[PDB]
Homo-oligomer: 267 residues x 6
């Protein structure tokens, strides 16, 4: 096979088009149920809140997994992390209602303390096998200069957990209690410097910002003086790539390209 | 020293040529004994099987270290990981016989569970100090989008273990039982986006694919319909860089450049 | 806000100039007290010794944190790591005296064994909250091909510990014993491939080299035959970027850009 | 309450009889489903195989959890751990069929490597919440001079996991996927120096020994020359306490006595 | 020395009386400031609430360290651990006010997740060196059948941390920031099966029980129907050893006897 | 087998005399090479220095394994742990010379930081398999009130490592580099409350105390005012059990009794 192509460029295009059937025309078109994985309460709204409302409005069931409890998100010396986590849970329930999301799984690892371990893969794999989502969204763990370990670990653990949910010897007691292996159809990484699919969110921008500001403990007015400019600059970064005012960017690749593929950066 | 050069380009070339005596003409020419480090059974054959056969055919002694047992490599709900691991040991013995390899060290860490720790360094440094190889091959841990932790950890632990095998206070009980410090002459990284040395394997391609397919548990005919196209695409990516049909790529650098070198990407 | 810009370029420049007030003109001008974090004894003098002497000579109080004891830095089978660590403490005290540094905190983690953990963050945040430095310097953990885990871990732990030092629920017993949250004004990363600020050290080069050679155990004459060429080639790399003979490079970014910022590589 | 008793002996007897309703007349009489937790394949048969057969013969459904794979159980240099594990799985299925057991959960931690961690607790609580057993058996982790960490860790993790299975904030994703909190009705510890309940197994001793010897890889004839005398000495130790030839001993206590009870050794 | 005694009994008594100056007449008589270390909110009140009130009433400053947040203490599926932990902080402040305690350090490790590690030692040693207490109370980690890892770990970590607070190379950054080594004068273990000092609390029993029931989330009326009988049975167990109605028991030993002492059980 | 004994006492005596061939008459009589494992430098001399000199004088080759470097053993704020450790290595070489010991393996784990892990077992098993000792001595990890984690961990790791050195799948790279499995003939535990074999050291007491005081950094004259009385009180405790002035005690048991043996405290 692949004996009659003559150049690498020809093989490459034939591998993507024919063998992997990859395309970026509308990667989310067939989804019925997706899971959006966030490191902290508010990252699904920040990274992809317009696209979550577009999906919910088309009748896609969007479920969150939140990896941590947001305990550390305050500079108030009188607000304990326990009290903040309870406040953030209610904030995310109000944000998610605005975006059409009706189910959140809380892993409850402490903020700044998310482990990078098989145990946390097992939590993700248990929920993937229970819910059988078509798509999974998570942060791109290769974002340049990303300095928060919870973000880098969420992205790597989500990619690994999507792969290992298909393997019956990984977390085998799930198979023994009736949670069968599941093969997700696509992963999409948000918070990405290298998007290859952009969703125009220009007419949902105000709704997105409203869903973000529902995390009131995080976005005081003072903080918003910097964050609204930031968030509009990011959405213009994405939207300008497809000639629209505001966009949300995602990186999607064939499953093969997440492993031993030396030209994965050509898409 | 280095006071008479005038530009960074001049200093850089003098550092590589004269001080480090670095050359990519024939980096494997003097090797008598090399160790090829693979994350899982079948990675030496996939990443570099053509070059392993060339080296064996020249009378180089090629030894494998396999970091993990391949336990997780099945989607059959009836095949336990213990039985798969036993099957894969036999597959690698048959693959290795085709490529001229006569010695495999099995570290037996569980697949998907290779630790990143001093303990696993010590296992690599014990074998390096026992066998005194001239060269060590391992995956490039900086391959973009590599999402298997066993692969990233094998590359980093091999680079570190080659450096630490020279240090008598590292794993000092080896020195006390007669395994002296050893200084490897070169490292070469396979599975790389940034090769700087390519071996033409055009006339060994069918043998490389045979050696790969000897891992029958991983390469069923259905899976091969994707994997032969992929493997030929990858070998054309490398071969095209030197104007040949099929190549295997390696990244080789002076030892110095694996540490505090801000222009290491200029080779 | 940010509704009247019409291109990403416009928004980006307005976000950096107006909202973040970021400028690379003289990022160190207002500093009264800085901490320089080194993985091993000698890294502050190698990565940034000229700039340390410039800062001391302006009356800046420069403090080191050394993460590890340098135990493993010998190929002499007769010198224990314990004896080497004692030797290296004295070498660093001599080197530091040459550069105007009068205080070093020794975390005493063993060389090649620095953990990547909350416990080590807590050590950094205790010292940052006690000393209240204006600036913190550390290695850039994203230097390409950096293969020493103690270097990568120092960079990431330093950036995370600057951020978490401002959070009263992080390491809360410090607040309870009277070490209040502290907000550092800038971070600067040395050992970097992507500097955006270069200090001319041409007239302090011989003093820098003297301060490095004070670490006699590391820089024997034989080793210096390779290391003087290396260090001059690095200083030319940096100095050529601003048209001077010898430079030390730093990467400085707005705090926001260390997290979720897809265009952080544009500075 | 408890204001009218006037001696500790009076209060103790009232607390056990009235408040805790504790007795040891026939602690297993009401059981419909029990789980027997073994560190390695063959420990349920060795510690309590006669009682398992009594229970199965009364219509009790007896389920095993085996914590490890038995990988390390050979002194044959030609038998890999992987092959041993596969052999021991078949040995246990044969042993279990002799004793009436029809379901085994295999956690598959490697022998000599069982962790003592929240992750292993979560595997035990998942199975306890799925199966809702009335009783759980495990080794007594306080057996004097017990030197195998897998045995000590299995006893502690079993006791902890029975308590934590009732707590909806412990391993909360189970509650989210439909596995509700479960309250086991008794624990019984085997392999105990301090039994307080003994089962007469005099007429099932030959069956018990057959079930043990079905683990042929462990009990070669040579090893059996020591192990039959050992096993009969232990069963006489227990049976002599109740005036019978062969017994199996268990320690049962009120749940309260597993925590902050300074007279728990008085039963 | 000790050459003129003739029997072990003679030597033993002379070691305790003359060399170690040990006695148990009134071990708390000279204390001005004590720390009571509890695993969870409510353990100081349960283990030793009468004695805490006796000490405060004498003008001793009693300070708590609470190792964990009590997150897991509920069987209500509607109450999150975060909310529980906030509730229990308030409960403890009310309980402590009743007993005369005015300061509590909260380590905030999650309940059922307290580590056994150098990091937690370092938190105890920072507080011991800041507060310089004369006495420290903690659970006896050798209580038979104690099945809660947080209780066993608190007792061992407290004993260890008392010893290591005297050592300037342990947690050396405390010494560098001005927290000098401290030598506690006594440890007293509560929750013990082997008390050697009993405090009569007969006239403070109703106050102790009030301070316990202030932890309303733990002691609902239904649970109290078992817990008041238990608590009265325990206090009778201790008081009967000194011929009083209700007592609290402590185990106190010379520092030497916590290490390499084969007759430590003779006191 | 064992069908003709009628009582447990009969079976027990026959199991020990005939099947296990257990004798406490002269357990060390056949030894040619023993390893004495100490947690810190000085514990072999303190726990068993008289016996080590008896054994050396009979021509037994006594080798030490010291698990830690003694870093923490000082209350001088000017003496670093690095310097202490180097001083203590020389102290031990002088002490060991007095006792006839000519070889010490230093594992160099930091004092107070000995792990309890497979990695440290592998260090012990590599030395056991290299040296093939007839006997191994270690602390009894079940000594009551032993509060130093390095002592408890040394005892358990030594017992485990003796057992696992016989198993070719444990630390299998040893067998691959030519270190075959080894079966030690006896373990003897020192620092024990339950000795069953006592060596009379009455005429070697002053030599033992000289070998202890050779650890000058630990035994200043001030400290010795407590430690001489302690050490003579301990040797009297042991010697009185066999009617001699000064003894060293050991606990020896058949290998079988270290596992699943409910009457192991009957010897
Ligand atoms: Cl075909
Ligand atoms: Cl085809
Ligand atoms: Cl990370
Ligand atoms: Cl405004
Ligand atoms: Cl020169
Ligand atoms: Cl020269
Ligand atoms: Cl990784
Ligand atoms: Cl085909
Ligand atoms: Cl505004
Ligand atoms: Cl505004
Ligand atoms: Cl790292
Ligand atoms: Cl020269
Ligand atoms: Cl009542
Ligand atoms: Cl009542
Ligand atoms: Cl254990
Ligand atoms: Cl026979
Ligand atoms: Cl004297
Ligand atoms: Cl005297
Ligand atoms: Cl524990
Ligand atoms: Cl009532
Ligand atoms: Cl027979
Ligand atoms: Cl026989
Ligand atoms: Cl321990
Ligand atoms: Cl004197």
């Amino acid at each position: 096979m692949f004996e009659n192509v003559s150049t690498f460029e020809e093989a490459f295009n034939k591998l993507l088009k024919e063998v992997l059937e990859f395309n970026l025309e509308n990667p989310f078109e067939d989804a019925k149920k997706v899971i959006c994985i966030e490191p902290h309460p508010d990252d699904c709204a920040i990274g992809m809140g317009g696209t979550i409302k577009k999906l919910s409005d088309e009748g896609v069931e969007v479920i969150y997994i939140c990896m941590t409890d947001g305990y550390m998100g305050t500079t108030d010396e009188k607000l304990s992390g326990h009290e903040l986590a309870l406040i953030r849970r209610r904030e995310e329930e109000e944000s998610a209602k605005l975006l059409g999301v009706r189910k959140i799984y809380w892993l409850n690892y402490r903020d700044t303390e998310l482990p990078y371990s098989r145990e946390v893969r097992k939590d993700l794999v248990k929920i993937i096998r229970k819910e059988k989502p078509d798509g999974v969204f998570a942060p791109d763990p290769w974002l340049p200069y990303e300095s928060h370990p919870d973000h880098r670990r969420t992205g790597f653990l989500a990619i690994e957990s999507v792969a290992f949910s298909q393997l019956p010897n990984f977390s085998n007691i799930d198979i023994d209690i009736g949670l069968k292996p599941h093969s997700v159809s696509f992963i999409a990484l948000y918070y990405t410097h290298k998007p290859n699919y952009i969703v125009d969110i220009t007419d949902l921008m105000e709704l997105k910002l409203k869903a973000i500001r529902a995390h009131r403990s995080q976005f005081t007015d003072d903080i918003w003086e910097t964050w609204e400019p930031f968030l509009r600059t990011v959405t213009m970064f994405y939207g300008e790539k497809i000639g629209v005012r505001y966009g949300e960017g995602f990186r999607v690749m064939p499953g093969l390209f997440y492993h031993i593929t030396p030209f994965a950066d050509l898409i």
